[model samples]
Target: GPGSRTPVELRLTEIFRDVLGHDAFGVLDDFFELGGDSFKAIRIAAKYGPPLEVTDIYDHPTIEALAAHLAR
Candidate 1:
């Protein structure tokens, strides 16, 4: 009952696990510092959000931020 994330947050994290190759990664992790660039970012963005762009991922480099962006 402690979970507090929305659907987007969880779904976003799911793709991040596939792209970043880390099952342990959470929404709090930093995307850029995690070694991601435009090359890998867009692949997941297009595949995941469909509404999301590479710049969106770059701008929202964290799960919380990405989820919020997607919500819009």
Candidate 2:
């Protein structure tokens, strides 16, 4: 479980950095509260491979947490 979890968290951190233009996105960072809106969420979701949805971004805004969900 630990092995599987690390990659997902790392990948998500990268995604957040690229999409939000921030290299310091912490695991506890709030997506919208930190200037991320719905439109930006869509842009971030697009970075995912396929079957990506706006809801997915909204539901999982944090990098570390979102990555785990996406990995599933």
Task: Report the C-alpha lDDT of model 2 over 1-72, residue by residue, as the tens digit.
Answer: 322347666655666677777665477777777668878777766776565567876787676557666667
Question: Ten residues in a row with the worst lDDT in model 1?
Answer: 1-10
Residue 32 displacement (Å), model 2: 1.0
Local lDDT at 35 for model 1: 67
> TM-scores for all candidates?
0.81, 0.68
- The digit string of per-residue lDDT tens for model 1 on 1-72 reads 112278878777777777877665567778878767887797687668577788988788988898887787
The lDDT for every candidate, in the order shown, is 0.75, 0.67
Clashes of 1: 0
Residue 36 of model 2: what lDDT?
A: 84
Candidate 1 regions off by >4 Å? 1-4
